[PDB]
Amino acid sequence: TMVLPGVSYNETLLTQASNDDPVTMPLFIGYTPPPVTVMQPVSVGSLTQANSLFGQRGTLAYSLRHFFENGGLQCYVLPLGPGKGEPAARLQELIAALQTPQMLETLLADDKTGLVLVPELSELNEVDADALWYQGWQVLLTLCRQAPQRFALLELPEDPASAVTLTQQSFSADQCQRGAAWWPRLETSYQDESSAPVVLSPLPAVAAAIQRSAHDNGVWKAPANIALAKTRRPTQSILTSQALLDNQGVSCNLIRSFVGKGVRLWGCRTLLNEENTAWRYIQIRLLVSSVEHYLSKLARAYLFEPNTAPTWMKLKGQVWTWLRQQWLAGAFFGTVEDEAFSLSIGLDETMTEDDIRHGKMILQVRLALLAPAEFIAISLTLDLRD
């Protein structure tokens, strides 16, 4: 019938620590340069790591080499098999390889890149390709569309009207939210086993600074005006291509070789060929997505909560804590926090008793927006002064 003091030990915890953001991670999705899987993404430490595995030669393997030698941070590699030879066959079975439903089951169960990249589109210039330019991208658009937050990365045909008529085509807004191209494909200083340049896609030199500027500056500043490392020049300037200047098809990203400075990147404005939606200016598309990744990062923590107003307040301190720093890190607009970000969870401010008895837990997330300073509208005034 008796009982001891029951000293009753217990303890508590710690650890918000979740931080990752692997949206800035790129994926190299080429074939195998001739014993990997045909299907899995593979992390890359370095070119000294990865390009020494399976040859520094191939198509991927140079654009492998063209990544960290342009200052990459880390890329991922999804090999695709020994591509056949006769690249017009290889780069159309690839479509049938893309037409496998086996893609998204490795893509939706990937959650470690946000950057979808195949640099192998230079062979499309070698070989109707414009339909393959079209419908191949149409695959890539719908993939990143049905992906939660992934992003297609393209390049144009350097030939005019092969790209112009390509831009002259029907595309939904949601895919034009996610995906862009670069018209000047690059003459690298890579040697084509000879004196010849390896004319590579800009895409690995593109991807290197992206996560790096996302590492260094954060995403919110810009991608552009970045001198490129191991390239002789962009193979074609815009001065010899007065086509694509018609802004009736969707926008591009130009790449320009400068005189007193390097080949500076000259385009960041998404294929929403549009003036008012804040879904041009690619960094804006991607700044939100990592925050979405960051708020999903903590959303699943608060999973089977109760529906109480104090339990709302527990989250309300957190985001008010977190984004404050981030706006004070200059990632966001506004000189006060109140115009920076605003929260609106409440009893009938987000929810109702129906959603209390449906157990919904709802919040309204506000943010005001910065803008980059793209153009220089100078006016002069002499102002006589007698």
């Binding site: 419908q135 149409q138 002259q168 595309f171 939904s172 109702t352």
Partner: protein
């Protein structure tokens, strides 16, 4: 999805059913059903079709992506009777030429999209657009809701229309209301017009028809648990409130075209009003409810003046 379709079914080689169904997922997501039948005049399973749709409680839209006319008009007449007992259907249809089909003559729930759309495949094959236009209703109800007419939405992935329509015969086809797929230079192909078939001022618009069709199906599904309760007064105020708190939430998100007053609903269930004593004995209830929906804004007129 498209993944589990490849497991259960197959893609053959000669054959347009596998092509017309993958264009549904590229436009808008969501699951879908399918009912395979082989012979057009096989009126065995065609008579056994409408008593299979009722046991699944969800079915809202109806379509048929088959190319030719003899197969589609055999279907459209098979389930044409199942539209007028008010369970909540809304089918789609295509037109073989410049006028509407006559298998369903005049009804409040049809919609006709005239020009058929082609698609490249290894000569490009034509395709009746009733398949991929079902997927574009799955995006508008996502972000904008039911009460927005899908017109400015852009078709996601096509080459060109089969026949190029111009504005001078748009004037003829926009009455006798049938819709149209248009082509523009800057933005490509786009759907255009959101008018239903029969043209009295009761329901001439797709969303005003589809707003009353969805508001009934949600309250009818939840009154089914209370269908044998006594007809006293405390039951009346509990039903009249749960309907009041449903239209008020839908009013304050911009779907009932009322002003800043309350005048968007007059739900009443009393006994002095809306009923009397002698139909209580043959047990009944009467729910007089009424809304004031919002109309789409077309024909914007400027009329500049000097002062």
């Amino acid at each position: 999805s498209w993944l589990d379709y490849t497991i259960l079914f197959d893609s053959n080689v000669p054959p347009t059913a596998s092509v017309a169904l993958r264009l549904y997922f590229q436009n808008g997501g969501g699951p879908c059903y399918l009912y395979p039948l082989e012979k057009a005049d096989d009126n065995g399973p065609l008579a056994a079709l409408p008593d299979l749709i009722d046991e699944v409680g969800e079915i809202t839209l109806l379509a048929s992506p088959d190319p030719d006319e003899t197969y589609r008009t055999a279907v459209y007449g098979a389930l044409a009777a199942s539209l007028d007992q008010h369970k909540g259907y809304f089918l789609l249809a295509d037109s073989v030429n410049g006028d509407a089909p006559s298998a369903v003559g005049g009804s409040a729930q049809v919609a006709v999209y005239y020009p058929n759309v082609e698609v490249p495949h290894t000569a490009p094959l034509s395709l009746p657009p009733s398949a991929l236009i079902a997927g574009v209703y799955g995006k508008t109800d996502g972000e904008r809701g039911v009460w927005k007419a899908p017109a400015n939405v852009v078709l996601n992935g096509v080459s060109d229309v089969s026949v190029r329509v111009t504005n001078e015969q748009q004037a003829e086809l926009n009455p006798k209301g049938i819709n149209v797929i248009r082509h523009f230079s800057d933005r490509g192909l786009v759907v255009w017009g959101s008018r239903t078939q029969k043209d009295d001022d009761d329901w001439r618009y797709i969303p005003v028809r589809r707003l009353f069709d969805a508001a009934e199906r949600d309250i009818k599904k939840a009154l089914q648990p209370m269908v044998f309760e006594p007809n006293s007064q405390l039951t009346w105020k509990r039903v009249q409130t749960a309907i009041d708190n449903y239209l008020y939430r839908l009013w304050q998100q911009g779907a009932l075209a009322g002003n800043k007053a309350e005048e968007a609903y007059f739900v009443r269930v009393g006994k002095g009003i809306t009923m009397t004593q002698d139909e209580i004995n043959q047990g009944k209830m009467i729910i007089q409810v009424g809304m004031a929906a919002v109309r789409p804004a077309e024909f914007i007129i400027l009329k500049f003046t000097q002062d």
